[PDB]
Design a protein around this ligand. Structure first.
Ligand SMILES: [C-]#N
Length: 153
């Protein structure tokens, strides 16, 4: 459960993300691809991307970073009442992308790392703890929908 004050922490850092969604999105996906290169074979769209250099210059990668952060931001802003906003995301990742839950733990770690590098004055122990809890509720809810489809992974 996040306390209301922990949701406020999440939302306060989020507003920082929002002032530069494309830069945050690039950092996050690159971080993910560098830390868990196997996840990159799950994105059809990025098969031409090899070097870090290539990732940084990619428009496909930047535009996707925006799409990912827009969808997640809409979910975080709901403070746990996100069934509507999460359902479409869950079902597509299950059916169309076949993304194991594990991948969701990887991109969570990436987001946490990036927030910390970028907004350290805002991203202390208290904020990291609340974000961790928000992302873990997000995964748990995703895993519930996967279940309903019979989608393992
Ligand atoms: C889609 N990350």
């Amino acid at each position: 459960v996040l306390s209301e004050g922990e949701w406020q922490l999440v939302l306060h850092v989020w507003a920082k993300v929002e002032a530069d969604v494309a830069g945050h999105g690039q950092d996050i996906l690159i971080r993910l691809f560098k830390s868990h290169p196997e996840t990159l074979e799950k994105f059809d769209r990025f098969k031409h991307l090899k070097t870090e250099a290539e990732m940084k210059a990619s428009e496909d990668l930047k535009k996707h970073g925006v799409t990912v952060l827009t969808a997640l931001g809409a979910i975080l802003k709901k403070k746990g009442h996100h069934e509507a906003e999460l359902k479409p995301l869950a079902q597509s990742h299950a059916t169309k992308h076949k993304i194991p839950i594990k991948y969701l733990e990887f991109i969570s770690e990436a987001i946490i790392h990036v927030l910390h590098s970028r907004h350290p004055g805002d991203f202390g122990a208290d904020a990291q703890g609340a974000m961790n809890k928000a992302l873990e509720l997000f995964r748990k809810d995703i895993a519930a929908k996967y279940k309903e489809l019979g989608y393992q992974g």
